[PDB]
């Protein structure tokens with residue numbers, strides 16, 4: 622309670638700042654300021670996890686061998702993808718597989 | 720194997736740019752909020768929200784490090800990492816952040 626609203630406004634403030642950074646072509650330096658190298662790497666790898674989960678060809682073990690992501694990391698990704706709204710999942714199939 | 724792989728560094732960078740482009744396009748069709756719930760943890764989202772306030776108060780230059788720690792619950796190492804990163808930011812970014820964050 623209470624703090625949850627505080628955190629939500631703080632998160633939306635970031636979302637809006639980055640929204641406007643993309644509009645002004647400052648998104649790349651903004652994301653270098655706001656994220657660590659390891660965090661950027663994780664996000665690049667999470668995209669590939671989403672891609673290969675949507676593609677449906679690799680087992681969890683095969684996805685681990687390809688990406689270096691452990692079984693628990695892949696399971697986190699699968700559970701998050703199952704939780705995503707349908708419209709996002711359908712769009713991701715289009716953007717990441719074609 | 721190379722002591723330092725420039726090839727792997729660039730491959731990782733392309734993976735990062737793929738995310739950046741994915742999120743750019745999600746902003747254009749109002750899928751950015753669900754995309755960020757998919758791609759980030761709650762703790763990571765909270766950290767990003769807190770980092771915005773660290774930048775704001777560092778640019779403002781008013782609060783001490785003790786005041787910033789007390790206000791945000793952010794250790795000295797966290798405040799220092801943000802100050803160091805602010806030092807590496809390009810002038811165009813710092814000027815824009817001043818315009819947007821400082822009223």
Ligand SMILES: Cc1ccc2[nH]cc(CCN)c2c1
Pocket residue numbers: 667668670671694695697698699701756757758759760761
């Ligand atoms: C796709 C994917 C793969 C691994 C992951 N680890 C943590 C997250 C954030 C969950 N909202 C994640 C997402």
Ligand SMILES: Cc1ccc2[nH]cc(CCN)c2c1
Pocket residue numbers: 653654655656657658770771773774797798800801802804
């Ligand atoms: C502004 C701020 C505050 C605290 C932080 N901790 C880690 C980072 C990412 C560094 N590029 C960061 C940025």
